[PDB]
Design a protein around this ligand. Structure first.
Ligand SMILES: Cc1cc2nc3c(=O)[nH]c(=O)nc-3n(C[C@H](O)[C@H](O)[C@H](O)COP(=O)(O)O)c2cc1C
Ligand SMILES: Cc1cc2nc3c(=O)[nH]c(=O)nc-3n(C[C@H](O)[C@H](O)[C@H](O)COP(=O)(O)O)c2cc1C
Ligand SMILES: [Cl-]
Ligand SMILES: [Cl-]
Ligand SMILES: [Cl-]
Ligand SMILES: [Cl-]
Ligand SMILES: [Fe+3]
Ligand SMILES: [Fe+3]
Ligand SMILES: [Fe+3]
Ligand SMILES: [Fe+3]
Ligand SMILES: [O]
Ligand SMILES: [O]
Lengths: 399, 399
């Protein structure tokens, strides 16, 4: 274990090896960690557990820290298997132990563990739980940040906010605190995380933060369920989330496509050249979706004022990886971003119009499409470049 | 070069390394080859070239076989870059050389090579080209098998049908002839090829074969543009195509899904057990789309009477790889197959209904869907198993 502050002990699990989260939908290229905390005042409280894959280790490590019977209360902020995963193993040892959680968490804990006989205690925002020595826990419901069951737990006196997934990041390090790790890697993992998981819930972020702040409670540390404990200037991550939640965008355009014979690729590269020579302010990134990290593409989309998406026509539909990405983007709800569809075709085409419509339905504000037949020659590449120039001019930010 | 028959010389290219065709849409796990043929009678005819990546080698190898100036005619059956790829390099050396091809091939050759000054000669079905010694070429247009430009070339006397893509397969071997290679690997590659590329054009297969047969011309060999030359019982591949074109299916059910926390996987395995114990005749295969070969999944779908497709709900939509696969299946036009959608959800769900509708639009005849909340317990798994039993009973073939 590691001492977080005073009688708060980190009793979680580092995961250097993990590469796949949510199936393969989120690639954790820097691993992750599952933070669980043991607070030892007059009452002993366990806050969350760890991923199911580490359940035996968790219980064993916990025994080394404290006799399991001495645990008075278990708080479950969020019942996803990367946090409540070890709960069955633990509860097997101390089956009578009270569990504190949201009403929705009873449904999700039961949905994963199927022990409805456990002693659940529903908490609502503002409910408290005394733990002695002048300190108490205060619960704050945070539904759909990012699950219906999600909440946060605030410890008075110590002024620590246990925020579970919120403000966390998948970034494995032996050091627990934000001031102890590489700051660029920390930032990168924070942003990849927000972009790929939290974007669709952005509308909930600012009201919930506003509500928590309105409690006028000190925040000396933010102890999340993934990655570092924010102890040095903890509000830096709070302010980043407020920025990120506000339909965030930089002066950046992302171009991504798939291609069967490189024709749409040629179009993409020409478009980029047109953008680059028209408006040097714009950061441009290009990705072949078949050959790139999907999550990196989406982080870039999150950071972008606009995107261009390419596909050729394949059996009268669009290329499948593009259809898949458009489905996912539809779910992610990118807002206030512009888009333009492009691609090549051999005869009757159709995939570009198909794509443009779906991008519009996903919430992108559509500019004109760009189409070419077979492989662009010199003249066609000029048109692609001019499309880049025209797009750059249309989406230009104020001087 | 290798002698095919008499004065027909194979002057193509083996590709042991290639793993990706059409972007990454077709995985060639046994490599491929690009067959080009040099016929040397009174006239010298080159039939197709090879993939663009081997253009220098092709021209060099061709020079070793014959002085380029002695080539009288060039036949282009199909202008995709894996066959017409070396044409620019070759034509640079013999720019005046006549090219024989379909009207549509002028558009596609120009679309890839941008040399409209080349001497194109449009051929129609039944057109001929004399090459001396009592032999001639007969051209047969085959539009949308698999491109608008596609045709085949028949050589009289020798009785050889140069079928380009049709009847070919991606299977690299140093031996040229079908009787010289492994028969199971040959078959497997033939079927993967038809399933993944030719299924949407199945309606065109039987009429075109009927037309070619109606010419009452002997077929001693079928020299395709990929893989083996069929010299031993060549009609075996013709008969396979007639079987495959007729909305082919075996007593086989394929189950495939994606999953974030293994819940839909548990449903899938239970469904399979229900099928297996109800109707032992049925071959069942299960695939996690995130962890399997996409083309193998589709070959199985091609071979199947019905499928079950699974997804959980992710940000109110379906999982992206499933959306992508459904897009591709929509393009492939599977016919006379049945389907059932299934999956888990956490709260409001929706992805299973979403999937079932898209499967219906793709042409599958839909049976009832199967839904479960969170992780299936014992009771829920019983329901999943019973779904398997019920599906097996509904789709059962006659005794
Ligand atoms: C498997 C396959 C299917 C195709 N289907 C269509 C089609 O339905 N309609 C069309 O106009 N072109 C079709 N084409 C032609 C391509 O759209 C054309 O080659 C285009 O220029 C390729 O662009 P890309 O290199 O970016 O993939 C198809 C090509 C392939 C290889
Ligand atoms: C990233 C993510 C997004 C989710 N979105 C939804 C949703 O929009 N609606 C819903 O009912 N459940 C949603 N869920 C809950 C899952 O559907 C639920 O966990 C389901 O049981 C997972 O099935 P699986 O393990 O086969 O992926 C989501 C879960 C995750 C991890
Ligand atoms: Cl990223
Ligand atoms: Cl188009
Ligand atoms: Cl296969
Ligand atoms: Cl559902
Ligand atoms: Fe979570
Ligand atoms: Fe988490
Ligand atoms: Fe082809
Ligand atoms: Fe080919
Ligand atoms: O989580
Ligand atoms: O091809």
């Amino acid at each position: 274990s590691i001492v977080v502050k005073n009688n708060i002990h980190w009793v979680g699990q580092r995961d250097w090896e993990v590469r796949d989260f949510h199936g393969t939908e989120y690639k954790t290229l820097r691993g992750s960690s599952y933070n669980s905390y043991l607070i030892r005042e007059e009452k002993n409280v366990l806050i969350d557990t760890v991923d199911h894959k580490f359940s035996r280790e968790f219980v064993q490590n916990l025994r080394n820290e404290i006799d399991l019977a001495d645990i008075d209360y278990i708080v479950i902020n969020h019942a996803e298997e990367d946090h409540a995963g070890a709960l069955t193993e633990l509860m097997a040892q101390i089956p009578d132990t009270p569990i504190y959680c949201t009403a929705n968490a009873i449904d999700s804990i039961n949905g994963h563990h199927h022990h409805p006989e456990w002693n659940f205690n529903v908490v609502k925002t503002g409910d408290t739980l005394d733990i002695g020595n002048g300190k108490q826990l205060i619960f704050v419901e945070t539904p759909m940040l990012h699950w219906p069951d999600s909440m946060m737990t605030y410890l008075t006196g110590d002024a620590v906010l246990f925020s579970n997934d919120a403000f966390g990041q998948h970034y494995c390090d032996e050091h627990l605190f934000n001031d102890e790790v590489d700051q660029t890697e920390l930032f990168e993992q924070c942003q990849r995380y927000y972009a790929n998981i939290l974007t669709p819930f952005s509308r909930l972020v600012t009201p919930k933060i506003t509500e928590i702040l309105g409690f006028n409670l000190p925040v000396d540390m933010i102890a999340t369920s993934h990655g570092v404990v924010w102890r040095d200037n903890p509000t830096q991550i709070v302010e980043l989330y407020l920025k990120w939640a506000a339909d965030y965008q930089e002066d950046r355009i992302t171009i991504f496509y798939d291609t069967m014979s490189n024709n749409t690729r040629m179009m993409a590269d020409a478009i980029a050249q047109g953008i680059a020579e028209t408006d040097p302010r714009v950061a441009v990134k290009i990705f072949n979706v078949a050959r790139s990290d999907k999550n990196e593409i989406l982080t870039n989309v999150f950071r972008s004022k606009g995107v261009l998406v390419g596909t050729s026509t394949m059996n009268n539909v669009m290329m499948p990886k593009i259809a898949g990405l458009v489905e996912e983007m539809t779910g992610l709800r990118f807002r206030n971003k512009r888009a333009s569809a492009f691609g090549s075709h051999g005869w009757s085409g159709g995939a570009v119009d198909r794509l443009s419509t779906r991008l519009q339905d996903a919430g992108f504000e559509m500019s004109l499409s760009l189409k070419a037949k077979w492989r662009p020659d010199q003249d066609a590449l000029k048109l692609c470049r001019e499309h880049g120039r025209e797009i750059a001019r249309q989406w230009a930010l104020a001087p």
